[PDB]
Amino acid sequence: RIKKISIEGNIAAGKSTFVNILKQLSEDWEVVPEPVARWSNVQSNGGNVLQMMYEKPERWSFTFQTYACLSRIRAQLASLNGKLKDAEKPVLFFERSVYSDRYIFASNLYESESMNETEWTIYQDWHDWMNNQFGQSLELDGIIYLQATPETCLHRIYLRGRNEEQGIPLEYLEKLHYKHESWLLHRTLKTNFDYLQEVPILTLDVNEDFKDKYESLVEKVKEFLSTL
Amino acid sequence: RIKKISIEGNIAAGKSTFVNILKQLSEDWEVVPEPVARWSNVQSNGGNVLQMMYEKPERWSFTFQTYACLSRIRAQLASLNGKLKDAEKPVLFFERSVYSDRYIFASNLYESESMNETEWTIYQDWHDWMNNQFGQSLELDGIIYLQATPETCLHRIYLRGRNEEQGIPLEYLEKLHYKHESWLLHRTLKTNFDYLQEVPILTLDVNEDFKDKYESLVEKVKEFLSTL
Numbered sequence: 001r002i003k004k005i006s007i008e009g010n011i012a013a014g015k016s017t018f019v020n021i022l023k024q025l026s027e028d029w030e031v032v033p034e035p036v037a038r039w040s041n042v043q044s045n046g047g048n049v050l051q052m053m054y055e056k057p058e059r060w061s062f063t064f065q066t067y068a069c070l071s072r073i074r075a076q077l078a079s080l081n082g083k084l085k086d087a088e089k090p091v092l093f094f095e096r097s098v099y100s101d102r103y104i105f106a107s108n109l110y111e112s113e114s115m116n117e118t119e120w121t122i123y124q125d126w127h128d129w130m131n132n133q134f135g136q137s138l139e140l141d142g143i144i145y146l147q148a149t150p151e152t153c154l155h156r157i158y159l160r161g162r163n164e165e166q167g168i169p170l171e172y173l174e175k176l177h178y179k180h181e182s183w184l185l186h187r188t189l190k191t192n193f194d195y196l197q198e199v200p201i202l203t204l205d206v207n208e209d210f211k212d213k214y215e216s217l218v219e220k221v222k223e224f225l226s227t228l
Numbered sequence: 229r230i231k232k233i234s235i236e237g238n239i240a241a242g243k244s245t246f247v248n249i250l251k252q253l254s255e256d257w258e259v260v261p262e263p264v265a266r267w268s269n270v271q272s273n274g275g276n277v278l279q280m281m282y283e284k285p286e287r288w289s290f291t292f293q294t295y296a297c298l299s300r301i302r303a304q305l306a307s308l309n310g311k312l313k314d315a316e317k318p319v320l321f322f323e324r325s326v327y328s329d330r331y332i333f334a335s336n337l338y339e340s341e342s343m344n345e346t347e348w349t350i351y352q353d354w355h356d357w358m359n360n361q362f363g364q365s366l367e368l369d370g371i372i373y374l375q376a377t378p379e380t381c382l383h384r385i386y387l388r389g390r391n392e393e394q395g396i397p398l399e400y401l402e403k404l405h406y407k408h409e410s411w412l413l414h415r416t417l418k419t420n421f422d423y424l425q426e427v428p429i430l431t432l433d434v435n436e437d438f439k440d441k442y443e444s445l446v447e448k449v450k451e452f453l454s455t456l
């Protein structure tokens with residue numbers, strides 16, 4: 001019925017930029033942005049849990065992983081009831097997914113000792129159960145991978161200018177890069193979700209300026225979508 | 229259909245002791261123990277997240293609150309499919325509830341500055357949403373309150389002999405006592421769950437030795453249950 005695509009990529013690869021092009025291309029196409037704005041002012045002022053994690057990751061990574069994933073799931077669940085329920089060829093695009101939260105971000109942070117065994121066990125337990133409940137509902141038909149070098153992404157952090165991201169070192173970006181390449185390019189990353197091994201993927205090199213690349217990328221997305 | 233009763237009480241008031249009397253009284257009566265054994269060895273060795281919270285509550289209270297509540301919900305959800313689905317007068321007893329997790333334990337820990345505003349906001353958000361999904365399903369028909377002085381409870385901690393609880397001071401027990409009295413005796417505690425204001429409650433003084441009190445308590449429970 002509703003085709004579900006996630007857009008995956010490193011920090012500042014250019015997902016929000018890409019996503020802001022999608023709705024213009026068909027009235028049947030909808031989008032679920034990643035709620036990064038919510039993470040900088042936690043509401044039911046507020047805690048900036050994004051800042052707290054980056055400033056003290058071995059203290060705040062679990063708390064962040066818990067809130068980020070949750071807020072994403074709710075945003076995505078919220079989209080399953082919308083103008084799409086009446087569109088001819090509905091396509092819902094997710095900015096990242098529950099799988100990147102876990103297999104890219106939470107995993108990298110555990111491996112870095114920003115989460116300990118206890119945190120990692122609780123988080124994966126929580127994540128297994130969250131998904132077992134909201135399973136078939138959020139399953140992907142396709143992934144679009146926006147591939148950019150960690151060095152391009154480091155530059156784009158600077159361009160975008162979120163205060164909380166300005167201290168992010170290349171090393172952190174590089175670890176996240178190789179995780180994405182493993183999952184989506186080489187397809188060597190194993191997950192607890194077997195259908196993901198089969199899921200079609202479109203990889204788009206977005207190292208060059210968006211304005212010049214815009215049209216070819218759009219062709220590739222329309223082609224890719226027609227084959228699902 | 230299935231009457232749902234929670235058993236509420238301070239640490240070592242005598243809930244497991246009480247609960248181990250329930251099934252004997254009718255084949256239609258089932259029980260969901262609080263998974264404290266899981267909390268001392270976190271599994272998907274293991275982290276003893278019970279110990280971690282008590283040793284460093286301002287570090288581990290949120291993580292514990294998250295895992296404890298979750299593990300309780302799953303245990304309770306698991307019981308809604310069981311021999312009860314075919315019993316004549318099924319009564320399911322919960323050892324504590326999602327409401328004590330929040331309004332007694334998590335609340336006391338926030339008020340003590342063991343959780344900060346950010347943790348407390350994330351936790352309540354999480355708890356609101358968890359309950360909005362698994363709402364009507366876990367709603368209570370009745371509460372049984374096992375009332376014991378914090379000084380009786382301090383003595384019973386010593387009798388029971390869990391290593392992780394041996395350092396618990398009277399002051400912590402006293403704060404939890406007055407919270408229980410507020411919610412269940414004076415009924416002055418306000419919650420985000422309006423039906424709870426109406427929920428019938430049976431208060432049992434369990435300061436005296438269980439063996440002598442056993443029979444009167446059993447009479448009061450059978451009476452109380454017949455009136456729901």
Ligand SMILES: Nc1ncnc2c1ncn2[C@@H]1O[C@H](COP(=O)(O)OP(=O)(O)O)[C@@H](O)[C@H]1O
Nearest residue numbers: 011012013014015016017156159160208209210
């Ligand atoms: N292909 C591109 N060419 C030039 N700038 C880009 C490109 N993609 C993204 N940007 C810019 O880089 C910054 C990060 O982009 P953004 O879309 O916020 O990335 P993400 O959503 O993946 O974190 C923004 O300043 C955006 O304008």
Ligand SMILES: Nc1ncnc2c1ncn2[C@@H]1O[C@H](COP(=O)(O)OP(=O)(O)O)[C@@H](O)[C@H]1O
Nearest residue numbers: 239240241242243244245384387388436437438
């Ligand atoms: N009424 C009672 N009289 C004597 N001992 C009790 C009584 N209730 C509980 N106990 C004992 O006190 C300790 C704590 O009881 P337990 O049932 O584990 O409490 P809870 O489950 O509420 O934490 C145990 O050693 C138990 O044997």
Ligand SMILES: Nc1ncnc2c1ncn2[C@@H]1C[C@@H](O)[C@H](CO)O1
Nearest residue numbers: 011034036065068069101105106165
């Ligand atoms: N799950 C996550 N863990 C850590 N960082 C995340 C996660 N999801 C998204 N991000 C990062 C946080 C912020 O730097 C960037 C904004 O899109 O994405």
Ligand SMILES: Nc1ncnc2c1ncn2[C@@H]1C[C@@H](O)[C@H](CO)O1
Nearest residue numbers: 239262264293296297329333334393
């Ligand atoms: N939610 C909770 N938070 C802190 N302590 C809790 C919670 N639920 C139960 N307990 C305590 C932990 C342990 O000391 C005792 C065992 O029944 O109950």
Ligand SMILES: [Mg+2]
Nearest residue numbers: 015016017034
């Ligand atoms: Mg973005």
Ligand SMILES: [Mg+2]
Nearest residue numbers: 243244245262
């Ligand atoms: Mg007990």
